[PDB]
Scaffold this active site. Structure first.
Site, PDB file in Angstrom:
ATOM      1  N   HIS A  51       0.795  -1.294   0.107  1.00 56.58           N
ATOM      2  CA  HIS A  51       0.094  -0.068   0.049  1.00 56.58           C
ATOM      3  C   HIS A  51       0.769   1.336  -0.060  1.00 56.58           C
ATOM      4  N   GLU A  58       4.391  10.628   3.211  1.00 58.55           N
ATOM      5  CA  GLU A  58       5.623  10.747   3.499  1.00 58.55           C
ATOM      6  C   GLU A  58       6.651  11.623   2.465  1.00 58.55           C
ATOM      7  N   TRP A  80       7.998   7.338  10.802  1.00 58.42           N
ATOM      8  CA  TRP A  80       9.249   7.681  11.569  1.00 58.42           C
ATOM      9  C   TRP A  80       9.133   7.719  12.916  1.00 58.42           C
ATOM     10  N   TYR A  94      16.124  14.152   5.294  1.00 58.53           N
ATOM     11  CA  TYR A  94      15.647  14.303   3.727  1.00 58.53           C
ATOM     12  C   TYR A  94      15.008  15.539   3.601  1.00 58.53           C
ATOM     13  N   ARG A 127      24.132  17.545 -14.484  1.00 55.85           N
ATOM     14  CA  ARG A 127      24.453  17.867 -13.005  1.00 55.85           C
ATOM     15  C   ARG A 127      22.992  18.161 -12.273  1.00 55.85           C
ATOM     16  N   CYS A 146      19.274   6.633   3.652  1.00 55.28           N
ATOM     17  CA  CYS A 146      19.604   5.538   2.795  1.00 55.28           C
ATOM     18  C   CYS A 146      19.464   5.716   1.472  1.00 55.28           C
ATOM     19  N   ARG A 166      22.418   3.416  -0.488  1.00 54.75           N
ATOM     20  CA  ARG A 166      23.466   2.930   0.254  1.00 54.75           C
ATOM     21  C   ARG A 166      23.329   1.805   0.780  1.00 54.75           C
ATOM     22  N   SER A 167      21.962   1.241   1.177  1.00 55.73           N
ATOM     23  CA  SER A 167      21.770   0.313   2.029  1.00 55.73           C
ATOM     24  C   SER A 167      20.431  -0.076   1.728  1.00 55.73           C
ATOM     25  N   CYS A 168      20.049  -1.421   1.408  1.00 58.56           N
ATOM     26  CA  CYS A 168      18.766  -1.934   0.872  1.00 58.56           C
ATOM     27  C   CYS A 168      18.186  -3.198   1.530  1.00 58.56           C
ATOM     28  N   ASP A 169      17.077  -3.071   2.278  1.00 59.47           N
ATOM     29  CA  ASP A 169      16.470  -4.282   2.979  1.00 59.47           C
ATOM     30  C   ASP A 169      15.425  -4.681   1.606  1.00 59.47           C
ATOM     31  N   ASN A 177      10.544   1.737  -1.500  1.00 59.23           N
ATOM     32  CA  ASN A 177      11.560   2.953  -2.039  1.00 59.23           C
ATOM     33  C   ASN A 177      11.434   2.972  -3.533  1.00 59.23           C
ATOM     34  N   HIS A 207      20.701  -6.263   0.685  1.00 62.88           N
ATOM     35  CA  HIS A 207      20.741  -7.406   1.489  1.00 62.88           C
ATOM     36  C   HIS A 207      19.273  -8.031   1.609  1.00 62.88           C
ATOM     37  N   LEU A 208      19.228  -9.354   2.338  1.00 58.09           N
ATOM     38  CA  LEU A 208      18.082  -9.862   2.689  1.00 58.09           C
ATOM     39  C   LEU A 208      18.226 -10.486   4.016  1.00 58.09           C
ATOM     40  N   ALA A 263      13.834  -5.451  11.191  1.00 59.75           N
ATOM     41  CA  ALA A 263      15.158  -5.823  11.786  1.00 59.75           C
ATOM     42  C   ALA A 263      15.466  -4.591  13.128  1.00 59.75           C
TER      43      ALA A 263
HETATM   44  C1  LIG Z   1      10.232   1.963   3.449  1.00 58.62           C
HETATM   45  N1  LIG Z   1      10.076   2.956   4.722  1.00 58.62           N
HETATM   46  C2  LIG Z   1      11.209   4.049   5.083  1.00 58.62           C
HETATM   47  C3  LIG Z   1       9.074   2.482   5.680  1.00 58.62           C
HETATM   48  C4  LIG Z   1       9.415   2.270   7.205  1.00 58.62           C
HETATM   49  C5  LIG Z   1       8.566   1.818   8.234  1.00 58.62           C
HETATM   50  C6  LIG Z   1       7.460   1.623   7.761  1.00 58.62           C
HETATM   51  C7  LIG Z   1       6.835   1.671   6.362  1.00 58.62           C
HETATM   52  C8  LIG Z   1       5.520   1.373   6.121  1.00 58.62           C
HETATM   53  S1  LIG Z   1       4.349   0.645   7.449  1.00 58.62           S
HETATM   54  O1  LIG Z   1       4.391   1.424   8.867  1.00 58.62           O
HETATM   55  O2  LIG Z   1       3.215  -0.015   6.829  1.00 58.62           O
HETATM   56  N2  LIG Z   1       5.457  -0.737   7.791  1.00 58.62           N
HETATM   57  C9  LIG Z   1       5.646  -2.002   7.052  1.00 58.62           C
HETATM   58  C10 LIG Z   1       6.740  -2.956   7.475  1.00 58.62           C
HETATM   59  C11 LIG Z   1       8.037  -2.196   7.421  1.00 58.62           C
HETATM   60  C12 LIG Z   1       9.132  -1.931   8.291  1.00 58.62           C
HETATM   61  C13 LIG Z   1      10.311  -1.497   7.901  1.00 58.62           C
HETATM   62  C14 LIG Z   1      10.431  -1.137   6.941  1.00 58.62           C
HETATM   63  O3  LIG Z   1      11.565  -0.198   6.602  1.00 58.62           O
HETATM   64  S2  LIG Z   1      13.023  -0.759   6.023  1.00 58.62           S
HETATM   65  O4  LIG Z   1      12.701  -1.874   5.121  1.00 58.62           O
HETATM   66  O5  LIG Z   1      13.391   0.249   5.044  1.00 58.62           O
HETATM   67  C15 LIG Z   1      14.036  -1.215   7.395  1.00 58.62           C
HETATM   68  C16 LIG Z   1      14.292  -2.413   7.599  1.00 58.62           C
HETATM   69  C17 LIG Z   1      15.207  -2.795   8.514  1.00 58.62           C
HETATM   70  C18 LIG Z   1      15.685  -1.852   9.336  1.00 58.62           C
HETATM   71  C19 LIG Z   1      15.082  -0.404   9.135  1.00 58.62           C
HETATM   72  C20 LIG Z   1      15.852   0.523   9.990  1.00 58.62           C
HETATM   73  N3  LIG Z   1      16.435   0.587  11.082  1.00 58.62           N
HETATM   74  C21 LIG Z   1      17.553   1.519  11.711  1.00 58.62           C
HETATM   75  C22 LIG Z   1      16.089  -0.295  12.195  1.00 58.62           C
HETATM   76  C23 LIG Z   1      15.200   1.985   9.689  1.00 58.62           C
HETATM   77  C24 LIG Z   1      14.564   2.127   8.778  1.00 58.62           C
HETATM   78  C25 LIG Z   1      13.817   1.276   7.949  1.00 58.62           C
HETATM   79  C26 LIG Z   1      14.364  -0.108   8.166  1.00 58.62           C
HETATM   80  C27 LIG Z   1       9.541  -1.077   5.640  1.00 58.62           C
HETATM   81  C28 LIG Z   1       8.386  -1.665   6.008  1.00 58.62           C
HETATM   82  C29 LIG Z   1       4.178  -2.860   7.056  1.00 58.62           C
HETATM   83  O6  LIG Z   1       3.688  -3.208   5.867  1.00 58.62           O
HETATM   84  O7  LIG Z   1       3.633  -3.421   8.165  1.00 58.62           O
HETATM   85  C30 LIG Z   1       4.906   1.455   4.863  1.00 58.62           C
HETATM   86  C31 LIG Z   1       5.692   1.865   4.055  1.00 58.62           C
HETATM   87  C32 LIG Z   1       7.185   2.259   4.209  1.00 58.62           C
HETATM   88  C33 LIG Z   1       7.679   2.027   5.323  1.00 58.62           C
HETATM   89  O1  LIG Z   2      13.972   3.721   2.793  1.00 56.26           O
HETATM   90  C1  LIG Z   2      14.908   2.515   3.579  1.00 56.26           C
HETATM   91  C2  LIG Z   2      15.468   3.026   4.707  1.00 56.26           C
HETATM   92  C3  LIG Z   2      16.255   1.938   5.263  1.00 56.26           C
HETATM   93  N1  LIG Z   2      16.385   0.748   4.600  1.00 56.26           N
HETATM   94  C4  LIG Z   2      17.046  -0.476   5.137  1.00 56.26           C
HETATM   95  C5  LIG Z   2      18.171  -0.794   4.788  1.00 56.26           C
HETATM   96  C6  LIG Z   2      18.903  -1.440   6.107  1.00 56.26           C
HETATM   97  O2  LIG Z   2      18.557  -2.720   6.169  1.00 56.26           O
HETATM   98  C7  LIG Z   2      18.228  -0.775   7.158  1.00 56.26           C
HETATM   99  C8  LIG Z   2      19.015   0.757   7.550  1.00 56.26           C
HETATM  100  O3  LIG Z   2      20.070   0.330   8.381  1.00 56.26           O
HETATM  101  P1  LIG Z   2      21.776   0.645   8.067  1.00 56.26           P
HETATM  102  O4  LIG Z   2      22.006   0.499   6.596  1.00 56.26           O
HETATM  103  O5  LIG Z   2      21.689   2.031   8.369  1.00 56.26           O
HETATM  104  O6  LIG Z   2      22.583  -0.064   9.013  1.00 56.26           O
HETATM  105  O7  LIG Z   2      16.946  -0.298   6.648  1.00 56.26           O
HETATM  106  C9  LIG Z   2      15.752   0.488   3.230  1.00 56.26           C
HETATM  107  O8  LIG Z   2      15.785  -0.632   2.746  1.00 56.26           O
HETATM  108  N2  LIG Z   2      15.035   1.366   2.859  1.00 56.26           N
END
Ligand SMILES: CN(C)c1cccc2c(S(=O)(=O)N[C@@H](Cc3ccc(OS(=O)(=O)c4cccc5c(N(C)C)cccc45)cc3)C(=O)O)cccc12
Ligand SMILES: O=c1ccn([C@H]2C[C@H](O)[C@@H](COP(=O)(O)O)O2)c(=O)[nH]1
Ligand SMILES: CN(C)c1cccc2c(S(=O)(=O)N[C@@H](Cc3ccc(OS(=O)(=O)c4cccc5c(N(C)C)cccc45)cc3)C(=O)O)cccc12
Ligand SMILES: O=c1ccn([C@H]2C[C@H](O)[C@@H](COP(=O)(O)O)O2)c(=O)[nH]1
Lengths: 263, 263
Positions: A51, A58, A80, A94, A127, A146, A166-169, A177, A207-208, A263
């Protein structure tokens, strides 16, 4: 999406195992790139329902350049919450960098407006860039950016954009993203009467997390479906005057959402 | 190199034409990425003779943090000659940002040392970054940074690095750009006691100038030869104590150099 699932498979097959900060552990690769032709459809993952409600608010919040979560709480967006202080502040993350990068001479630099003007007046510039990686303010941010830097490009009336993340879950963050920036490209394109080109996604530590493996396998066993289409209900007076309601995606028919622990 | 020729071929085959400022036309694509496993050999193109003399001096100059070309003049390096002012100053370019990025306060951040310490004491960090894109000082630089941002990564004791280059003259600039960063990775790795990993090059506006076509067709007709090997004669006491004479390249057997006009 095809490229998204290929990325998951690659991290699976070629990723290096680590034990990390907090000890979660991840499989990771370094350096990857994907390309999304926005004209093929809005790049919203179909192999699991996602969704954009929070993503849209945001993004609008980023464009206003405010870093206090007041607006987000008003619209029940908790993205946040975990990092804001008791005053609901996040530091110069940002939005602040995007709209008012502090120039030690006393003033600030509005990168979004700079880029708007470059796209209209000098679209061939090499640029047209927006950076959130303000080295001198990193220590004051609640989290290190990130999605650190993005560049625009124009060819044959189509607006392209490349993001460096720089970093991607891959499982949890990446789908959002991609949608965030795909959305921004559309908004920018509209404000410049350009068509949409490619969104190029480039990642560093990609990463995963280990605890997302079952979920990853489940997703890998599903077939991508046609991409939805994005609809913008009006052309605001500027990139800064859009409203949540201006956006609507149609034709979105995903597989069931997949829940997973953060995480 | 295989990867280098593929990019050149790609820009030729898929690049868009652009005749703009002054007339200098280009064929360009937006968004590209390639990887060089530094253990396979040092990535100096072999399909035309390239020299590292100027690149090595320039890298050492960057690392000292001085942006006055005096050191370059003393060594017959003309790279920045055209841009230095009466006193030989270029403004806060690369070196200044790498070693002393100006903080809003009354401070300076040494990104190089920061990165050294992260690699030694926190190698899995996902934010081991050096950025030259200091938005606040862009207008004070003689030229906007082309190789604007780079990130390091460590896996199984090997040091990897990804560069984001916003604009790239594939024929004239890219060969030197790849060599410079490959060299920095070797120096960084030596100083942090790690083996060399991959150098990942990521480009934004990647082009081939119109007046480089004869040279391009010629070079595309040449087969790559075995990569040479970089020799570092001694291990300096720090990343800031390297000398020109420390470096040597063996096994470099390139095709004849190809001269070309600069835009
Ligand atoms: C992409 N970002 C910045 C988002 C962050 C938090 C919640 C998000 C939601 S939501 O409120 O609906 N929550 C999700 C689950 C979730 C949790 C973390 C995540 O963020 S991440 O994959 O980028 C992520 C993964 C692992 C660690 C993160 C970290 N650290 C420092 C703990 C900091 C910031 C993001 C992190 C992305 C999704 C749900 O559908 O239930 C919807 C859309 C985007 C979200
Ligand atoms: O919009 C975002 C914000 C964070 N991250 C994920 C990447 C990392 O798994 C974690 C941030 O941790 P560090 O890379 O700062 O350690 O959140 C994303 O994938 N997308
Ligand atoms: C930034 N780097 C890559 C370099 C720049 C200038 C000279 C260099 C030399 S050298 O002193 O040995 N000179 C070359 C010819 C040459 C000229 C420009 C060039 O630079 S480039 O491909 O990145 C290049 C191409 C087109 C335009 C450039 C531009 N502008 C603003 C016009 C500004 C900066 C670089 C430009 C690359 C090579 C020669 O052997 O004669 C050796 C090694 C690197 C050099
Ligand atoms: O180290 C460099 C410095 C510049 N360029 C090329 C890119 C462009 O062709 C030109 C700089 O022009 P702009 O992108 O700033 O317009 O030099 C490189 O390829 N490598």
């Amino acid at each position: 999406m095809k490229q998204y699932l290929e990325l998951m498979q690659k991290v699976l097959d070629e990723g290096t195992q680590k034990n990390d900060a907090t000890g979660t552990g991840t499989l990771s690769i370094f350096g990857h790139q994907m390309r999304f032709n926005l004209q093929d459809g809005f790049p919203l993952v179909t192999t699991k329902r996602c969704h954009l409600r929070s993503i849209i608010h945001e993004l609008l919040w980023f464009l206003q350049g405010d870093t206090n979560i007041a607006y987000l709480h008003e619209n029940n967006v908790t993205i946040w919450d975990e990092w804001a202080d008791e005053n609901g502040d996040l530091g110069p993350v940002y939005g602040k960098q995007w709209r008012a990068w502090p120039t030690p001479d006393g003033a600030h630099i509005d990168q979004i407006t700079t880029v708007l003007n470059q796209l209209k007046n000098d679209p061939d510039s090499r640029r047209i860039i927006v950076s959130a990686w303000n080295v001198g303010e990193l220590d004051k941010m609640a989290l290190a950016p990130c999605h650190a830097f993005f560049q625009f490009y124009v060819a044959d009336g189509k607006l392209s954009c490349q993001l460096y993340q720089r970093s991607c879950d891959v499982f949890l963050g990446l789908p959002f993203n991609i949608a965030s920036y795909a959305l921004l490209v559309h908004m920018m394109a509209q404000q410049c009467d350009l068509e949409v080109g490619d969104f190029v996604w480039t990642g560093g530590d990609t990463h995963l997390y280990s605890n997302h493996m079952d979920q990853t396998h489940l997703q890998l066993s599903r077939e991508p479906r046609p991409l939805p289409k994005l609809i913008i209900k009006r052309k605001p007076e500027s990139i800064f005057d859009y409203r949540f309601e201006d956006f609507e995606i149609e034709g979105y028919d995903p597989h069931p959402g997949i829940k997973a622990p953060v995480a």
